RNA sequence: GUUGGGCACUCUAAGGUGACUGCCGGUGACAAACCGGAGGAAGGUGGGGAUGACGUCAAAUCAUCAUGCCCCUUAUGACCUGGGCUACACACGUGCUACAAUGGACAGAACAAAGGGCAGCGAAACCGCGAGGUUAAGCCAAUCCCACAAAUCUGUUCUCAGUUCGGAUCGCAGUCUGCAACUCGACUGCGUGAAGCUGGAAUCGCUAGUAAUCGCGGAUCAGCAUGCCGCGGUGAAUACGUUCC
RNA sequence: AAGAACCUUACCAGGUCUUGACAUCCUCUGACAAUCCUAGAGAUAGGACGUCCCCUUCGGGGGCAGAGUGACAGGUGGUGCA
């Protein structure tokens, strides 16, 4: 368990960290580099020491509920100014200048 | 030495046969390095095999243009056309395999 | 519709009017040319000029204006010419020259022919007649074909519809055939009417 | 005569029409084609390709 | 002396070089005979869209034909004779 | 660009800097929907043209860094 | 009006078999003949490592069992709807041999294509699997409606 | 080639040559043809483009343009600023990118053609995670710069998972361009991680360097490409036959 | 008409001018003008500052500009069964 997330055992560490909300490939890569540990080792084949080090590096990053809240307070902020983007957030329409007529289904 | 210009597509191979041991050296590399495919190498040797001059001559090609397949066909065509300068008796055996025809299949 | 015969026969059997190389001056030297030829038209609207060939040489711009009325073109002692030059000299910016040759047999050149018919239709000469004068004049000139057309409200006739009196052959099939072509618009008191005039003038062998 | 440089747009320098203009000649597709035919455009002949 | 000729008609461009070479050879300087340089092919494609996606193509083309004329062991009379020669309206004489 | 810094029309920034001399007081009408909201604007009501009418937008803290036109939606749709 | 000549393919350089080349060209996708030249040479090393026989002994045996003898052709003269038993021309035998070999090899469960193609050849050679079945299927069907022709 | 080195070869591009039933066998009116055979790069209509006749829809265009008769003519002319053209319950058309392993990620070699560049291309050097910025080499040019390829191939890892598949979308970083990127730019960091496990009926097109697939350049152009137009790289399957249409 | 941020742009909202944006003149003939100051959202302004056209037998004219001037000019406003 890392940052309160049960990362999978069978897959490699880099992959298992991508599941951790707030960690992608390149974050997982520079975590394990900063941990001074092989990035080819497996989670099932790691050490509790190595886990500790990985866990210490990840504590410096904003991940999971910490990050989810940061993102959510932005949704607040935009609906708290009635900004174009705010209104696009609450309406469920594209917020960055994408057309609606067709090809907007992710939002709609 | 016996010279013969080959052309396929945009490739243009300046073939030169010299008395040797069946080494094809294209732009100062072994043919295997320059042309990876075995199928292409066999087809490049096809004029030397039919005249039974494989192991008689060292082929010194200077190629420029097109790709790896293309470069092949021009070498093949240029070996064939070099052999004709080596021995006019080969014309009959080459011509039967269609090696003396220039493949003028351009893009549409 | 059809390809402009001249369009597809330039640099082939006919030549450039605008004989000049120019790299970075292209547009300057070009739009100049456009004034020069548009000026000599508005000026010499009645002098039977067509092939206003324009050559160039840094600041020595030559204008050959081939004219069927060359005695009329020069003027009383080069009066028309000199006045033409000074305007062009003050417009273009260069030493505008005035070499002049003749359009012998105006009925060989299709611009002049189509210009002749342009006036007849303004002065209300029956479409019928207008062309036939040209046709027969062009035949005697020595032309292997002609195809005058006039199209529009013909005679003030409410319904516009086209009238073409065609003699000889119009071999558009032959890239080496010298098909001249020239269009013109005939503004009467019922709109405008289209003078289109083809002239095959012997093969270019 | 536009205010800023960006606003300044290429217009057909013969037509005046502000569309389709060829930077080499400063002509719209129309004014060019016509003049190309007549053959007043120093070395620009119709092609077959 | 190095001369570069550029034209839209290769005929007048050849007739030019002939004289440029002949005037230099009567002048007595050795000539590098007119090098044909890679002819420039500017193509202009005016499309008139029909049914939107089909589009009647009309292609125009300008060819600048080029010739390079080196004059070796140049002479006073050559340098003169080059300026004396009148290369036509459709040739650009660069020295 | 982002090295040049945030954008604001000098015609507007002058109007609001005159109000910063006094205490807010007046309400500025402008057509500079493109002007960034600076900290100096905080507390003001800015009348911003939405294409037909001027929308009165009160300038709070979270509105700093955005443009004025973010708060004056130009297109009507329900 | 006169039967167009089929394109003369080169022999496969290592097995000297224009059949094996034709397989490569059948396997080739998006003009990636490299990928298919690799896959086959990988598949034939798999066949030779398992069986011990030459891949050519097995592959020719595989084709024998896939290659059709009689095929159904639709004939609708007046009514008819006759599935005319037609003898497969020797070129169309190899065609349908290689087509089915490749088509069913791609559909197999094995992870890599080199293994999938190897296993379909090994199954075809043992007179079993799906590609052999497909030949049987059309022959069973051709035998079923054999009263036409 | 970097330099010396005629220049050979490749190329560049002006002019010539070459292909025909010319030739040799059959076959057949001894002719024509047909069927083969030579020689040639080319086999029997060399291959791509371009170039047609008379016609029709009082077809479409008075928004390319011009234009009789009208109409407006302190306005139906004109000027600016902001906005809209970019809305979206949805549909009709066009295309891109995936729906993984004949891959993804990851490293190591590669091998093009064409076109553009002075108000421009910008070398390299230099900094940044990169997009970019730095200062600027050489060059209106077969000489310098943009380009100097991607597929592929050699590795090399994951293991058939909605995944190292897929990247939508959204949140946060910046970079250029322009007066200005809020509505309304492109691009890059970082995080996020949608649908899709390759779509029926139906329907359209295509006999070879074609289908397919991969990059590149250009036009328009301050910036803006999943379009258009070039350009090359790799490269298929099949045509049995006149059965039905 | 996949090179619409402004421009383009023709539309809308709001401001704004009326030989009018532009246009032959009819003339008078000035410089035209940058300009940078004050507003403005800008246009439209008002204005600091800034006006020598040259040739001229030295008149006038080619002008360009304003004002006048005169019909108009200009219309992407109708009619493609003119």
From Swiss-Prot, chain A:
Oligomer and partners: Part of the 30S ribosomal subunit. Forms a loose heterodimer with protein S19. Forms two bridges to the 50S subunit in the 70S ribosome.
InterPro entries to which the protein is assigned, alphabetical: Rbsml_uS13_C, Ribosomal_uS13, Ribosomal_uS13-like_H2TH, Ribosomal_uS13_bac-type, Ribosomal_uS13_CS
A Pfam family per the record: Ribosomal_S13
Keywords: Ribonucleoprotein, Ribosomal protein, RNA-binding, rRNA-binding, tRNA-binding
Role according to the record: Located at the top of the head of the 30S subunit, it contacts several helices of the 16S rRNA. In the 70S ribosome it contacts the 23S rRNA (bridge B1a) and protein L5 of the 50S subunit (bridge B1b), connecting the 2 subunits; these bridges are implicated in subunit movement. Contacts the tRNAs in the A and P-sites.
UniProt superkingdom: Bacteria
GO MF, any single term: structural constituent of ribosome
Sequence similarity: Belongs to the universal ribosomal protein uS13 family.
Annotated region (Disordered), positions in chain: 91-108
Protein name: Small ribosomal subunit protein uS13
Name of the gene: rpsM
Gene Ontology biological process: translation
GO cellular component entries: cytosol; small ribosomal subunit
Swiss-Prot record, chain D:
GO cellular component: small ribosomal subunit
Binding positions for Zn(2+) per the UniProt entry: 12, 15, 28, 31
Keywords of this entry: Metal-binding, Ribonucleoprotein, Ribosomal protein, RNA-binding, rRNA-binding, Zinc
One GO molecular-function entry: structural constituent of ribosome
GO process annotations (BP): translation
Cofactor binding mode and count: Binds 1 zinc ion per subunit.
Deleted gene: phenotype: Cannot be disrupted; as the protein decreases in cells 70S ribosome formation decreases rapidly, with concomitant loss of uS2, uS3 and YugI (general stress protein 13) proteins from the 30S subunit.
Cofactor(s) essential for the protein: Zn(2+)
Key word rRNA processing present: no
The keyword Ribosomal protein is assigned to this record: yes
Quaternary structure and interacting proteins, as annotated: Part of the 30S ribosomal subunit. Contacts proteins S3 and S10.
Function according to Swiss-Prot or TrEMBL: Binds 16S rRNA, required for the assembly of 30S particles and may also be responsible for determining the conformation of the 16S rRNA at the A site.
Family indicated by similarity: Belongs to the universal ribosomal protein uS14 family. Zinc-binding uS14 subfamily.
Protein name, UniProt field: Small ribosomal subunit protein uS14B
Organism: Bacillus subtilis (strain 168)
Gene from which the chain derives: rpsN1
Swiss-Prot record, chain E:
Superkingdom as given in the UniProt entry: Bacteria
InterPro entries per record: Ribosomal_uS10, Ribosomal_uS10_CS, Ribosomal_uS10_dom, Ribosomal_uS10_dom_sf
Gene3D superfamilies: Ribosomal protein S10 domain (3.30.70.600)
Key words, A-Z: Ribonucleoprotein, Ribosomal protein
Gene Ontology molecular functions: structural constituent of ribosome; tRNA binding
Coiled coil feature spans: none
GO cellular component terms, semicolon-separated: small ribosomal subunit
Biological process per Gene Ontology, one example term: translation
Alphabetized Pfam families for the sequence: Ribosomal_S10
NCBIfam families, A to Z: PRK00596.1, rpsJ_bact
Subunit structure: Part of the 30S ribosomal subunit.
PANTHER family named among the record's database cross-references: 30S RIBOSOMAL PROTEIN S10 FAMILY MEMBER
Function text: Involved in the binding of tRNA to the ribosomes.
Family: Belongs to the universal ribosomal protein uS10 family.
Name of this chain's protein: Small ribosomal subunit protein uS10
UniProtKB/Swiss-Prot annotation, chain G:
Keyword Nucleus belongs to the record: no
Xref: Gene3D superfamilies: Ribosomal protein S7 domain (1.10.455.10)
An annotated Gene Ontology molecular function: rRNA binding
Signal peptide: none
One GO term (biological process): ribosomal small subunit assembly
Keywords, comma-separated and alphabetical: Ribonucleoprotein, Ribosomal protein, RNA-binding, rRNA-binding, tRNA-binding
The keyword Phosphoprotein appears for this protein: no
InterPro entries: Ribosomal_uS7, Ribosomal_uS7_bac/org-type, Ribosomal_uS7_CS, Ribosomal_uS7_dom, Ribosomal_uS7_dom_sf
One GO cellular component term noted in the UniProt record for this chain: ribosome
Subunit structure: Part of the 30S ribosomal subunit. Contacts proteins S9 and S11. Interacts with VmlR.
Family classification: Belongs to the universal ribosomal protein uS7 family.
Role of this protein: One of the primary rRNA binding proteins, it binds directly to 16S rRNA where it nucleates assembly of the head domain of the 30S subunit. Is located at the subunit interface close to the decoding center, probably blocks exit of the E-site tRNA.
Protein name: Small ribosomal subunit protein uS7
Native source species: Bacillus subtilis (strain 168)
